[PDB]
Amino acid sequence: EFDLSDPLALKKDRPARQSDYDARNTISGMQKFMGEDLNFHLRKKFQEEQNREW
Amino acid sequence: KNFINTNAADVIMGVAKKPKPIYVDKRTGDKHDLETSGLVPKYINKKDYGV
Amino acid sequence: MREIVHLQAGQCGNQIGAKFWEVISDEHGIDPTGTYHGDSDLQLERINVYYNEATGGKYVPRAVLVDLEPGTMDSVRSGPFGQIFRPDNFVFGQSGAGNNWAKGHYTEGAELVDSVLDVVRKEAESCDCLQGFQLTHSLGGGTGSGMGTLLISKIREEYPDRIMNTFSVVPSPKVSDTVVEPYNATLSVHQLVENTDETYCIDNEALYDICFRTLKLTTPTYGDLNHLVSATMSGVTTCLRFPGQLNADLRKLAVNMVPFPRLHFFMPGFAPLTSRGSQQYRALTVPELTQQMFDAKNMMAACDPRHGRYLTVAAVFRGRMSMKEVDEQMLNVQNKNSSYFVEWIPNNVKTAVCDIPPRGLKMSATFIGNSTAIQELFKRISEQFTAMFRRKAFLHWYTGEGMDEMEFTEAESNMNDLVSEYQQYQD
Amino acid sequence: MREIVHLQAGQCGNQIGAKFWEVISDEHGIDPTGTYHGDSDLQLERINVYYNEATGGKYVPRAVLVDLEPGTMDSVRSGPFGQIFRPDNFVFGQSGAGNNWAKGHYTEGAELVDSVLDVVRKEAESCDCLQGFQLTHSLGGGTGSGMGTLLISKIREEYPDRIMNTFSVVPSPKVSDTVVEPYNATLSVHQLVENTDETYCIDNEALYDICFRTLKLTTPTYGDLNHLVSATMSGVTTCLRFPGQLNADLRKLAVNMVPFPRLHFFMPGFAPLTSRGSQQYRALTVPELTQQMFDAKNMMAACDPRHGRYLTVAAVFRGRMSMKEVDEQMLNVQNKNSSYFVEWIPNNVKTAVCDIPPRGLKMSATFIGNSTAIQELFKRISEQFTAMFRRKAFLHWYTGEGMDEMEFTEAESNMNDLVSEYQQYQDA
Amino acid sequence: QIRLNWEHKETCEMDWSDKVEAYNIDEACCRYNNQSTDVQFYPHSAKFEE
Amino acid sequence: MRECISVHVGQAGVQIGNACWELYCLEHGIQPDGQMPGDDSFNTFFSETGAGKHVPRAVFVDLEPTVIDEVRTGTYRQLFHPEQLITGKEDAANNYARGHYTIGKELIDLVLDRIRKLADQCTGLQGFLIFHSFGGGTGSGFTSLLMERLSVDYGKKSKLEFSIYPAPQVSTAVVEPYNSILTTHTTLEHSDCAFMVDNEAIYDICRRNLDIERPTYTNLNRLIGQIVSSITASLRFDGALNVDLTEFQTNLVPYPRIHFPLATYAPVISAEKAYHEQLSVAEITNACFEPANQMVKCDPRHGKYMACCLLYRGDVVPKDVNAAIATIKTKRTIQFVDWCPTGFKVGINYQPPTVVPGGDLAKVQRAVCMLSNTTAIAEAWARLDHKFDLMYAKRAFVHWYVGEGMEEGEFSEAREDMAALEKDYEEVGM
Amino acid sequence: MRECISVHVGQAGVQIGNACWELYCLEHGIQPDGQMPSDKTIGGGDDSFNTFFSETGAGKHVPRAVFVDLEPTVIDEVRTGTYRQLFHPEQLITGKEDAANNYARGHYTIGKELIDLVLDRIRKLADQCTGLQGFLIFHSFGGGTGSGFTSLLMERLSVDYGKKSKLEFSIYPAPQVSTAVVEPYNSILTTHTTLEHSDCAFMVDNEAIYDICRRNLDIERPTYTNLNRLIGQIVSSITASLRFDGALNVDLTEFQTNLVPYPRIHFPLATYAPVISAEKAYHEQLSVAEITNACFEPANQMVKCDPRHGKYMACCLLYRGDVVPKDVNAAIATIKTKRTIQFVDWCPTGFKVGINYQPPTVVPGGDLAKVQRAVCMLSNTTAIAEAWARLDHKFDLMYAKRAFVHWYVGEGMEEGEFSEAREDMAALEKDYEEVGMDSV
């Protein structure tokens, strides 16, 4: 149990979501959601070009 | 208004502000309160004691 | 060993039960066809709490899915995890409830209550020592609020000594779907005080405030609000599924939270919620769980405890951590502010520590807190029951299913008594 | 474990705080991504006075950033060091105050305060032994002065044993930026009286007189005026971050310079400032700090102590230097200018020596000076209040948020006490 | 420059090792006195003075 | 032939017995799979069989399976016999009533059968040790039921207690006071000696003496095991003054209602503060009477000692022991009661304490464990009474106890009995 | 057998204790890391170090010291410096907030928290000692910890420990320069409350040692180490009769008996004569008469008061190195003949001498020379009655307007302790009068 009194754990600690795409971001770990919208801007511009040709 | 007169009278006709007592535990400087801890006798002084 | 039979009813109950069972199966390592593809051994040890066994190593859940229309559970049979639910557990009726408490309680759901009771009695006596049951429903609807309270009333006549829970979704004056949710909520919250051991409170206007002020989502859906409900639904039953330094089942939190048998309306909150852009500025440490879990901006009810007094407070930690730094932060909160804590209890807070964190995460915590601020939830609903009721607003819908106006009259003098029950400790 | 939670409010508050956090991070070796890339071992030993820690060796400051304009936050994130702040600590409203007091004290600033008082207790309770706060604001504007006197007023009532300072940018008469500023300046200085422990006065026309003449810059901007405000902001808090031969911190200075608790308006300065033409012509010796730090041209206020009396003097030195030459010049300026010191305090000068110089420099020194020559600052605001207030000038702008005209009346008699308290201690 | 520094480290450090062995020999020679044992006669050889 | 039968009740009992039996298996030369790679000094704890194995004389009891199943599939799974680790089906749930009446009655008879089977193999059995926790439901109710059933079957046999008393400031639960009062009142006449520990006090000792910030229950269990080994050392290792198990009761319990002593282990220091400091007999004797090293957060300078027992281990000499004791007999800080003119019992053992790999404490040559009986433990029952009043004025939590078959008069009679106990502690010191 | 427990309190006390305990490691054989390099007779060896160092089983010598502070940034340089393996970790006590130039914080509020932790550690050091002579204490009157807590430490040393001797070294505040504003109020309220609870008091001012270093040594622009290093040359010369062989031993009990006549007059004044630089020592012999006469020079005193305005009340002389006891006797008879130096009439004998053998130790980096002979002298003078007259002057000056008392009143102190602490000194300012007039 040296890790509980470790003075370098916060130095050698690594975040729960370091990047957007990583392996440990499943549904029980609640750092990843589906409603966060990425690819919203591209959906908006796709809809607007369809509106133009329409 | 005499501030030089009244600032003298503000401190004499009063009371000192007594602290909440504290004990420092370790050489690092860990400071606790004294009454809440189980050290000083406080609870045998109750009126419910021994009856 | 210690089984949990899951019951859920309504569109709100089924869309929560579709997301809770996805969380558990990722936590126990279950792929969407049934088998086990995990990596540890602790994932397969206590798996009979939720999953029954079948032939060929296939684990299917202990759920009963109830409704009154068929169109809700075709989107549950056709989702990602629609193939693991055993298809005889689905119970559906052909004509709905139509936002009516009466029609689901006396006419349409009186012919379907005895159809579900064959399913539960079949399978809750396949267990070896059933701990208790669980409901998840909506008080603002017609099926869960009218017939889900009918199943609660029937199974507490047959299995009395066990546990009942509800993750009830009481309505909201701000986020208001229907017009007639005052009548459905008031007639059901009188059915909750006599027949449930524990009962939480969930407002969709308080789940919105988490997805806008904490997780910063641009377009939250109902598929994100069900993620947060199911956060506080596995984190409560998490110490009889995994070992720990200090265990606590569902009954040990019932003993320590409710003083009097008519005072059991808690309100939840979950500790490591973090936005995407605020992700690398955080430290995953024990002080930073116990201090956002206690935040009034975090709670899963639309009532704030800065108006009332905390009767009791629970906390269920997960993850390998130190018992000294868990215990010093409960004394640190109880002593700074002795105006929000009741006096005839000297130590209000309970702690239990599991071992296995949520999958893909390091630490976690949950809050199950009993307050006298929960009475403003009822009187912001009972101020719109008697607003409608003095003019006999929508009453012809309800009287035609065989009730009387006395059933409407007793259900606010039972609701106001509980309001004045939680009131005498507020000062 | 002697922590400083640094508040800053207003556009003047935020873009001073963005520059103060550039000089601290270079002083402690923090690159703009947050991490630590220094070389020594004293740049990491006591860094928790200002910086918290996150995961991965990242350090984020203990700052809170407050404004009523949403368009001030994007100026903060446009600098080099705009990504070191945790994004929760920004507190932005939607509608500004716009050169007003009651708009910022009762109407809009009184409903923005209760979301900041969650954020300061968010951080003050997570310190091992908090020493006190700081504030940086301008009395001329409305966000910094209408609400920044209510930010002070709540936190003295909740935490009354700790320390509070203000680096107040009180308005100047010659650089008269806005017409309605004497009402904001007058009505807010009484809320500074009862609550604050220490208070400096940083006039903007005093900073212009340095950059025109001492540094000889052709085009000084506000980036070259926040440099001087923040070079004396970290020269006070420097010996509780780095070790010394004689120590002093924020509490010890308030003990020695404040003999009565209504007398806390100082006059900062900063010693080694030199133009580039006079750069190679200089000698880097000890009395070439004390000759400039005590020079009446060098002060950061727009008032002069040739008119009044030094009650006390502080001085903080930085650099490996000799205690005899540090101590003998203090005696040398006390004996010579023997008519500029009060009689009823006979050792008016307090001294500290800190070992570590600021990075890039060899020695340095910082001044804080308490005087009855700062009552001439308050009477010039009082002359342009009642020259303007007798004819009821802009009164409908203020009285329509539910002020009172007697509340205006009490706010010069609260100020005419300090201008006649400082007179009786000048007769002594 | 890295390999040059490691060469100089090795050189000064061999000097340190020789001084350690000579220090232990002179401690054992500083032990002795009259009624101490483990002292004995030796022939006079020129290797002693060389 | 000098056997001790250990009984562990509760999760505290199981998680303490893990560290204790690890220490014993490493103190003798016993593998984690029963074999030994001769002398019979193990025979007070381990019994040999016909397959070369040495199976312990213990009984682990819990009402909940997920704390003994880790023993059943841990490192030591081949050592423990499968029928010495008894598990219920559903726990007592912080309830004295459940742990005493409704749930402990299905589990009391099998443990009595196992204790009969173990005690019909010890030819020279000294007595039982009970390790339990006041706060928990099993460790209060079932432990008190076991103490009520032991005395009618074994009589004048020695039974000893290690108790996790409720800590003065931090507690894990809300319903600790009802459990504590209702176990004290009903075990008060069926117990011979009850040593106290407090988890908060051992937290302070691990934080301050050792440098282990953020300790854990295993770091506490190692020190508890060191204390147990020092108490039972002289029945196994050779000594200059042997202290048998039948003497702590005789020399620490003056009155049959006052059997509540407190424990200290003297050189609990780390591997950098053992390099700087010599650890002689006078230093380790003078450090047991220090109120910063006690294992209950209470101060004996506010009270009067009534009996003391000092156990010495290692490289110790009788005159150094004698000079240390006669120094501590001369402080005006250490005040004894009027009617205790002698005071002390001293025991001396040769074998130095045994180091576990992974442990905290360093390797030493000398150690002391001291069990002292003080009047200054009255404020503990005073705070316990006050918190029982604070809950019981408004009749809080009472249905949780009454619904499982116990009347409401037991609360009233338990508070009356422990009020009489407070007057006893008041009046014996004057 | 001849143990003495050093107590250091304050940043002034801690920084002095660094230079004192550097000297004691080279004066004996101990390395910075606590080992003698080798022992020529391992079973034998000399045990001279037991007055200061305590030896464990293996080889390690740990000092008999307690370093006290209320600010963390002073001791943490000791804790991670060269001598971080020499000191036992628990002897360096710190606080978390300093007492902040305040007698009230140092006595009543902040300093009354560490008092029951240092008293624990003092008993652990005072029970190793077979033959404890007395405690030494190093402090400064113008601090918070050096004035508040140190006045508190004497009071609970009187209760617990009885008559056991408690000698002081203090930094009395200099008359001209001073690094504080509330240095009067501390210096009055500490001198007043430690009259009955103190045994002796040797006083030195920083301004006076500045005069010697620029003039007698050649080092211009000194630093507080150059002042600290000279203080270690005084404490070693007091205690070197307890460790090294002597022709006249002087114990630590004989200073109070031979310099403190009356129960409110216990303030001698230190002086150390041959401090001359290593180029200016190349030219002049340093005989016993050349270094006896130099203690009596007011330009070589170690306090800023002149004894030519007052009467000597007693003297003490400690000699090191190569001195003949006959030539000691020749110089003292000479300094009696000069009528520039006057003794009080009721003290006809007025001396106490002590002759040692070990010459004082050269430390690398120090500015003195290697010298055979040395004198340290402690003399009690009536010309200290001019030092309280310039401290009455500067206490009442802030007390006319009652400046700064609001800091002290709300920190646990009633205001009536100001109008008794000075009015106590008024007796002491006229108590020094009645021993200053002849017996007609």
Ligand SMILES: Nc1nc2c(ncn2[C@@H]2O[C@H](COP(=O)(O)OP(=O)(O)OP(=O)(O)O)[C@@H](O)[C@H]2O)c(=O)[nH]1
């Ligand atoms: N000091 C210490 N206390 C422990 C340890 N393990 C458990 N505890 C204590 O155990 C108490 C919790 O009660 P339980 O351990 O569950 O006792 P129980 O008899 O099993 O109670 P139930 O689970 O309801 O049957 C806490 O108050 C802890 O103080 C330990 O290793 N050391």
Ligand SMILES: Nc1nc2c(ncn2[C@@H]2O[C@H](COP(=O)(O)OP(=O)(O)OP(=O)(O)O)[C@@H](O)[C@H]2O)c(=O)[nH]1
């Ligand atoms: N002679 C000498 N005096 C010193 C030395 N260091 C500090 N001083 C004195 O220290 C005094 C200032 O108070 P400090 O000792 O630094 O601080 P303190 O005693 O801890 O009191 P607080 O700062 O309030 O905690 C000044 O009067 C100096 O004369 C030193 O090394 N030698």
Ligand SMILES: Nc1nc2c(ncn2[C@@H]2O[C@H](COP(=O)(O)OP(=O)(O)O)[C@@H](O)[C@H]2O)c(=O)[nH]1
């Ligand atoms: N939080 C949450 N609320 C839901 C969900 N589905 C429906 N609701 C709410 O429940 C109410 C409608 O549910 P409803 O279909 O009438 O429930 P039913 O009558 O029992 O079938 C509305 O207030 C919705 O906002 C869900 O998945 N999550």
Ligand SMILES: Nc1nc2c(ncn2[C@@H]2O[C@H](COP(=O)(O)OP(=O)(O)O)[C@@H](O)[C@H]2O)c(=O)[nH]1
């Ligand atoms: N010294 C200095 N003065 C400033 C700065 N920013 C604004 N000011 C002065 O403050 C006044 C404008 O303040 P304003 O931003 O409107 O007040 P705020 O809204 O409270 O921040 C003008 O007189 C400016 O000269 C700055 O960064 N430094």
Ligand SMILES: [Mg+2]
């Ligand atoms: Mg249990």
Ligand SMILES: [Mg+2]
């Ligand atoms: Mg200090």
